[PDB]
Amino acid sequence: SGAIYVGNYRVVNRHLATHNDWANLVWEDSSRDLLVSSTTAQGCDTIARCDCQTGVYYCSSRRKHYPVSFSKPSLIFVEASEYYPARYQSHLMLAVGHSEPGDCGGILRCQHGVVGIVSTGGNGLVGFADVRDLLWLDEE
Ligand SMILES: CSc1ccccc1CN1C[C@H](C(N)=O)CCC1=O
Ligand SMILES: [Zn+2]
């Protein structure tokens, strides 16, 4: 689990969104495994606006923060899971690292801010849903 709090927005994995998130829905995309809902209180996170390929991510199944190199956001085939059938997931970035289903929500961050959140894993790889193209998160 995990979320990003920026301005009056809450960014979570679409598969982990609550009844309140759907009731206060701003934007969602099943093909990205992302959902944004509105909040009453102001958040303190800053979204990165960059093309960085190195950062650090939190892995809850290891209680550790790992430095990693990661790929550019792309359309990647993702095997069937408890929450989605087999499909292509868009805006996804991979790194060599550990990831288990309950690790979804873990933040990936570079020197500029939050880059994305853990969304996929398996085979010694970890995948992150990019949020750097969602420019509207910085305004209104
Ligand atoms: C070894 S499977 C694994 C590992 C780490 C994380 C996630 C998974 C499988 N998964 C992928 C889904 C998706 N984004 O398409 C989201 C929910 C889920 O459980
Ligand atoms: Zn950056």
From Swiss-Prot:
Active site, UniProt feature: 15, 33, 104
Self-association state and partner proteins as the record states: Homodimer.
Species for this entry: Coxsackievirus A16 (strain G-10)
Catalyzed reaction equations: Selective cleavage of Tyr-|-Gly bond in the picornavirus polyprotein
Protein name: Protease 2A
The protein's role, per its UniProt record: Cysteine protease that cleaves viral polyprotein and specific host proteins. It is responsible for the autocatalytic cleavage between the P1 and P2 regions, which is the first cleavage occurring in the polyprotein. Also cleaves the host translation initiation factor EIF4G1, in order to shut down the capped cellular mRNA translation. Inhibits the host nucleus-cytoplasm protein and RNA trafficking by cleaving host members of the nuclear pores. Counteracts stress granule formation probably by antagonizing its assembly or promoting its dissassembly.
Residues engaged in binding Zn(2+) 1: 50, 52, 110, 112
